[PDB]
Amino acid sequence: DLELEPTLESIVQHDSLKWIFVGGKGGVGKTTTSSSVAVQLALAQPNEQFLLISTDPAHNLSDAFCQKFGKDARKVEGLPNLSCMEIDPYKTIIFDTAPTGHTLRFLQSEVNEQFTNPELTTFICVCISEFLSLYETERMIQELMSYNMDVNSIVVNQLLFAECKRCESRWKMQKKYLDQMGELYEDYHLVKMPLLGCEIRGVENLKKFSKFLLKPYDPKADSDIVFDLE
Ligand SMILES: Nc1ncnc2c1ncn2[C@@H]1O[C@H](COP(=O)(O)OP(=O)(O)O)[C@@H](O)[C@H]1O
Ligand SMILES: [Mg+2]
Ligand code: NA
Ligand SMILES: [Zn+2]
């Protein structure tokens, strides 16, 4: 079977991973995706300890989790096996690389043997379906491949789906690039994630978002999620 599952299932069930990097253009949903992945990992294996670290020069994790984080790791309230860390420079470390274009200088020696080992390290690209993000995602992947960092999954986030005149017009754009991505990323897990009815904040909402990272979102059947955030 040549059609890869459009999910992060292969990554979250990849028991040997030590590093899960998350990268992409500013605003595409790296805080959201990296936090949701970390929440899923923590929930699935409650006896193992997970760290979510962000290099974003922002209180991104703090605002997403509604809890104060910093340079020292601190456990997430309600998920005692997940810690978060915000540092402007564990079974698995999930690593939001914001700003990705700069952090890709930092990821540059026994750590390197870890990074270039596909059994220990993967890099999830996040993008939105518009020209700049797509083309910068292509560029980022080419660069990661040249440094032998594994990439097998790409999240396309903030999608509107079939069917509001503005939304119809915007979906016309989105699907044009989505169709292009389908072809570009045939050898990849290409996860289609919908735009929700509000920002994604708090552990409960992050958990809900993470559901469709692991099971393919069907806009005809699953659209309650858009309005299901509290
Ligand atoms: N699928 C989505 N639906 C609704 N809001 C989203 C979605 N993805 C991200 N967001 C929101 O969009 C904003 C940017 O997302 P964020 O994950 O912080 O991007 P990044 O970390 O890539 O800069 C945040 O305020 C976040 O709550
Ligand atoms: Mg930024
Ligand atoms: Na390669
Ligand atoms: Zn609309």
Residue numbers in the entry: 2 to 90, 156 to 174, 220 to 274, 280 to 346
Q: What do the paper's sentences say?
A:
Recently yeast genetics and biochemical studies indicated that the post-translational insertion of the TA proteins into ER membrane requires the co-operation of the Golgi ER trafficking (GET) complex which contains Get1, Get2 and Get3. Get3 (also named as Arr4) is the yeast homologue of TRC40 of mammals. Get3 can recognize and bind the TMD of the TA proteins. In this study, the crystal structures of Get3 from two yeast species, S. cerevisiae and D. hansenii suggest that Get3 may adopt two distinct conformations: an open conformation in nucleotide-free state and a closed conformation in ADP-bound state.
To obtain the nucleotide-bound Get3 crystal structure, we have expressed and purified Get3 from another yeast species, D. hansenii. We were able to crystallize D. hansenii Get3 complexed with ADP. The crystal structure of D. hansenii Get3 was determined to 1.8 Å resolution using molecular replacement method. The D. hansenii Get3 forms a homo-dimer in the high resolution crystal structure. The bound ADP molecule can be clearly identified in the Get3 nucleotide-binding domain (NBD) in the crystal structure. The finger domain in the D. hansenii Get3 structure, however, is missing in the electron density map. In the D. hansenii Get3 structure, the two nucleotide-binding domains (NBD) face to each other and make close contacts. The distance of the two Mg ions located in the NBDs within S. cerevisiae Get3 dimer is 26 Å while the two Mg ions located in the NBDs of D. hansenii Get3 dimer are spaced only ∼5 Å apart. In the D. hansenii Get3 structure, the bound ADP plays an important role in associating the two Get3 monomers in the closed conformation. However, in this paper the structure of D. hansenii Get3 complexed with ADP was found in closed conformation.
